[PDB]
Amino acid sequence: AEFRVRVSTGEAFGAGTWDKVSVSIVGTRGESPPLPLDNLGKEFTAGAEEDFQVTLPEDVGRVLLLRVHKAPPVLPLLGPLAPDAWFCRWFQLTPPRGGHLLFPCYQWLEGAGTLVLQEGTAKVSWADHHPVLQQQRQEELQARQEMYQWKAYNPGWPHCLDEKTVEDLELNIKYSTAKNANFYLQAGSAFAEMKIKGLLDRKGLWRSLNEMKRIFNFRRTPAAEHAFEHWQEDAFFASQFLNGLNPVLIRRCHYLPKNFPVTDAMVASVLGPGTSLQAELEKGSLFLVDHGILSGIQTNVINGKPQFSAAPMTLLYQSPGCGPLLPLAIQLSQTPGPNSPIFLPTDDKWDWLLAKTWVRNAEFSFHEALTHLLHSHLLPEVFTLATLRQLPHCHPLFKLLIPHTRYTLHINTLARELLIVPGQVLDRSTGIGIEGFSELIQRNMKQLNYSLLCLPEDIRTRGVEDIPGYYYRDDGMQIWGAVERFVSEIIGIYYPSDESVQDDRELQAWVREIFSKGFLNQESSGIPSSLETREALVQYVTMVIFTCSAKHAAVSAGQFDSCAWMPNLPPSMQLPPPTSKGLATCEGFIATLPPVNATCDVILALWLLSKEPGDQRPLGTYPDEHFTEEAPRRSIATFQSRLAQISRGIQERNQGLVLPYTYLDPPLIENSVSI
Numbered sequence: 001a002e003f004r005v006r007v008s009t010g011e012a013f014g015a016g017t018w019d020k021v022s023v024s025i026v027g028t029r030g031e032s033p034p035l036p037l038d039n040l041g042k043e044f045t046a047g048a049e050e051d052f053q054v055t056l057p058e059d060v061g062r063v064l065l066l067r068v069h070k071a072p073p074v075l076p077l078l079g080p081l082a083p084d085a086w087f088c089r090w091f092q093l094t095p096p097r098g099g100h101l102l103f104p105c106y107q108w109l110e111g112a113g114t115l116v117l118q119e120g121t122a123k124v125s126w127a128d129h130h131p132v133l134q135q136q137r138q139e140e141l142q143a144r145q146e147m148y149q150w151k152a153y154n155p156g157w158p159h160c161l162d163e164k165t166v167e168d169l170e171l172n173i174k175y176s177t178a179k180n181a182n183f184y185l186q187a188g189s190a191f192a193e194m195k196i197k198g199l200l201d202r203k204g205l206w207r208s209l210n211e212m213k214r215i216f217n218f219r220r221t222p223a224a225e226h227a228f229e230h231w232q233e234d235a236f237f238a239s240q241f242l243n244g245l246n247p248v249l250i251r252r253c254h255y256l257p258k259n260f261p262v263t264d265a266m267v268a269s270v271l272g273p274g275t276s277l278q279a280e281l282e283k284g285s286l287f288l289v290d291h292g293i294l295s296g297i298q299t300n301v302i303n304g305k306p307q308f309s310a311a312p313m314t315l316l317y318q319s320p321g322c323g324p325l326l327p328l329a330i331q332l333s334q335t336p337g338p339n340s341p342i343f344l345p346t347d348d349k350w351d352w353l354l355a356k357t358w359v360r361n362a363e364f365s366f367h368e369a370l371t372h373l374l375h376s377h378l379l380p381e382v383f384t385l386a387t388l389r390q391l392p393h394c395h396p397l398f399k400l401l402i403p404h405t406r407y408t409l410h411i412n413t414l415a416r417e418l419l420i421v422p423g424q425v426l427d428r429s430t431g432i433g434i435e436g437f438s439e440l441i442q443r444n445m446k447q448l449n450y451s452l453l454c455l456p457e458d459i460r461t462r463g464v465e466d467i468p469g470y471y472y473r474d475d476g477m478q479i480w481g482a483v484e485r486f487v488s489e490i491i492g493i494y495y496p497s498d499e500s501v502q503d504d505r506e507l508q509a510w511v512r513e514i515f516s517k518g519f520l521n522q523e524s525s526g527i528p529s530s531l532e533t534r535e536a537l538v539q540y541v542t543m544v545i546f547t548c549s550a551k552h553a554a555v556s557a558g559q560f561d562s563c564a565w566m567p568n569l570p571p572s573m574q575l576p577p578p579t580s581k582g583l584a585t586c587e588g589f590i591a592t593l594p595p596v597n598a599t600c601d602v603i604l605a606l607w608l609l610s611k612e613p614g615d616q617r618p619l620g621t622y623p624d625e626h627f628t629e630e631a632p633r634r635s636i637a638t639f640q641s642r643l644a645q646i647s648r649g650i651q652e653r654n655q656g657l658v659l660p661y662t663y664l665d666p667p668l669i670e671n672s673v674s675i
């Protein structure tokens with residue numbers, strides 16, 4: 001008839017509560033009356049953990065549900081008070097001479113109401129058929145689906161959350177007040193610096209290449225100074241296709257596209273007389289970076305001046321024996337001919353540099369619209385929203401995935417509110433603008449596939465499993481492995497058979513919703529619409545976790561490093577590509593690069609998005625203990641120590657590198673997409 005009730009309250013700002021709190025214990029034999037927890041004093045302040053003794057009049061049998069009621073204090077003749085939001089971490093029941101029942105919560109009880117919690121043992125739908133529990137899950141998902149709905153944002157995009165402003169979001173999916181203030185103080189300080197130098201207000205060109213170094217009095221990193229030092233070197237231009245901002249396009253080439261008419265003469269130069277184009281295509285030493293998806297893209301206006309975008313192709317040569325990757329030829333158009341010369345490293349200094357810079361402009365547009373926004377933000381939001389809608393709090397797959405959604409709905413809502421709207425940085429300072437970004441996302445959504453999101457298949461598909469110096473691959477594959485091993489352990493704990501995967505109705509609705517709302521029911525994407533085997537579930541969940549953590553970390557962390565020296569990543573171009581050779585100059589080169597205000601507005605935004613503001617939850621670190629069972633908790637431990645070992649490999653590796661690759665070091669990977 002006695003229970004001890006132990007309650008943990010959150011540490012965040014505002015976590016604690018004035019309000020009175022009572023719990024009803026529901027069991028197989030019946031439900032108890034509400035039981036007070038107010039005890040003596042302000043028991044529910046931030047960071048508190050405190051015990052209460054409740055006596056149950058009637059026995060309840062096996063405990064099934066904990067109902068938590070919250071209500072503001074009540075004054076005689078004056079009514080209640082304003083509700084005081086409470087962040088509850090978890091409850092622990094301890095019956096007479098029995099073990100502990102632990103009820104993970106980790107949510108906000110804003111205002112007055114009641115919250116129903118199952119014990120912490122993860123339960124697939126078929127795992128406990130008690131009707132009281134089936135009702136609770138069913139009611140929870142109905143409530144979630146009303147809370148968190150879909151809207152169509154643009155034609156041909158993935159659908160997104162049906163909310164207009166960050167103000168309208170539930171506490172449970174909002175930035176913490178600490179992370180939010182850290183964010184606005186950074187952005188505020190940075191905008192102030194950049195504005196008071198008049199650089200956000202200079203229309204017109206940079207005065208010289210020297211003047212563009214002024215960006216280093218704004219912000220400095222060693223990676224970014226390296227780009228100033230080495231930007232003109234062919235080996236650094238090429239190395240950034242493997243370890244820079246956008247390391248996902250390079251692919252081995254046995255057959256040159258017919259629209260890229262490279263000749264033997266054009267490459268005898270770099271290749272030596274001991275070989276031939278056809279001989280190197282066959283040897284597997286030639287690689288292609290194809291920016292064709294940009295062809296004919298709508299372009300923007302900046303300070304009333306039309307801007308330009310190319311859609312180029314770059315041939316690259318892997319020299320033997322850990323030698324450098326080297327560019328061989330660049331065509332800046334998808335349609336060859338006399339007005340789209342094929343530029344070579346042997347051309348005049350500024351012809352070749354101008355050609356390389358247009359490719360670097362193309363990486364800017366490709367990376368930010370597709371690799372960053374669509375693949376690392378929109379797809380994680382779909383995964384997140386589907387999870388909220390289809391997987392209930394007690395489901396092992398919710399327990400597993402929820403840390404990897406943190407703040408994702410918040411940050412995408414913010415982008416839709418303040419980033420991709422008129423007057424903001426996209427519209428005022430990029431070459432392709434809002435419309436070009438949407439065009440790119442619409443095109444990509446029509447040829448996107450599962451293999452690009454699964455890193456081992458992506459590496460295999462692109463024929464880049466052996467190319468040396470590819471640290472995005474080296475480190476990403478180790479991480480992929482660690483996540484895959486973690487997910488496979490967790491699946492094996494709770495799903496005994498392929499039949500049990502199919503029989504999971506909630507799991508099947510979750511995949512289906514992702515396929516429909518996120519991938520627009522396109523069977524050409526190859527993304528599963530159902531999951532029939534344990535093996536396929538493991539692969540699919542690994543893809544979600546990897547995409548939400550390491551994938552976004554890999555393509556977000558080098559943004560500022562890559563763009564601080566603007567010729568290394570011009571966000572726009574102001575003259576069309578050259579239509580013949582022998583015309584490029586330094587003066588002409590700076591005249592093609594973007595105006596000062598657009599340069600700085602973009603760097604300011606890339607600096608703020610490169611860095612996690614506020615506090616970090618690095619990959620594998622799970623302070624909200626949704627898993628309360630020994631087995632998953634061992635699996636977490638194994639995942640954490642494997643990441644730490646990968647991190648030691650990365651520092652040892654990086655020790656003897658002039659340009660270390662840090663974007664996939666696990667401590668610096670966030671669990672979710674949050675910036």
Ligand SMILES: CCCCCCCCOCCOCCOCCOCCO
Pocket residue numbers: 185186188189192193
């Ligand atoms: C971290 C402060 C956040 C303040 C937000 C808006 C600030 C308005 O302008 C002041 C920020 O400018 C900082 C630039 O540094 C000049 C101040 O002194 C720097 C040497 O300590």
Ligand SMILES: CCCCCCCCOCCOCCOCCOCCO
Pocket residue numbers: 187368369372373377411412414415416418419425426430602604605606608609675
């Ligand atoms: C002064 C502009 C600072 C930016 C503040 C708003 C950031 C909120 O959105 C971030 C989430 O969006 C991520 C998508 O990738 C961003 C692509 O934009 C880069 C073009 O500059």
Ligand SMILES: [Ca+2]
Pocket residue numbers: 014015016017084085086
């Ligand atoms: Ca409060």
Ligand SMILES: [Ca+2]
Pocket residue numbers: 037038039040041042043044
């Ligand atoms: Ca109290």
Ligand SMILES: [Fe+2]
Pocket residue numbers: 372376377552556609673675
């Ligand atoms: Fe991001």
